[PDB]
Design a protein around this ligand. Sequence first.
Ligand code: GNP
Ligand code: MG
Length: 166
Amino acid sequence: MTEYKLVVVGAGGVGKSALTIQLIQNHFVDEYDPSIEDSYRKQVVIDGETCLLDILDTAGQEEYSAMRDQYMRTGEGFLCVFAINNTKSFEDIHQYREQIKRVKDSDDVPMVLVGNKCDLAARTVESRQAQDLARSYGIPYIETSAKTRQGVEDAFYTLVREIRQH
Ligand SMILES: Nc1nc2c(ncn2[C@@H]2O[C@H](COP(=O)(O)OP(=O)(O)NP(=O)(O)O)[C@@H](O)[C@H]2O)c(=O)[nH]1
Ligand SMILES: [Mg+2]
């Protein structure tokens, strides 16, 4: 099987853990609310290929993590997550992009822009605004809800496909 190192990044509270947990849960534990950053694994078939996804659920840029630079060096692809009801989180996307570019010294890193919490009516970031931002980075944009599961598998599998076509 092929192993992929994925890193989930974004501002505090956008749903980085919720997304990761929704993908990787085997549901033995009913509720799991991770308090700090951690690594998770998921085996899945994507376009006929058996993949092992190593998924790193990072803390926001706000919190200190000693290993952050090495997480980014190791990471092969990045989910850049914001929340559609949090303008600040959307504006923060630039910070996360620049951090990844600074560490990896590259303009062509596999990424997916993720607008999470799309189950919510109180939207402050229009899809067209995020599509515009994604198009300026030359990356896919996908809207997700970690509550409903909408788009969650698609976001991760799109990232794997970006890594592949790199
Ligand atoms: N309505 C809604 N709430 C969501 C969604 N995803 C996460 N949340 C909620 O938003 C809050 C933050 O979720 P969490 O997964 O902790 O986000 P985080 O980005 O990992 N936070 P941290 O940076 O502190 O680790 C929680 O109350 C969670 O239930 C979603 O898709 N929809
Ligand atoms: Mg978290």
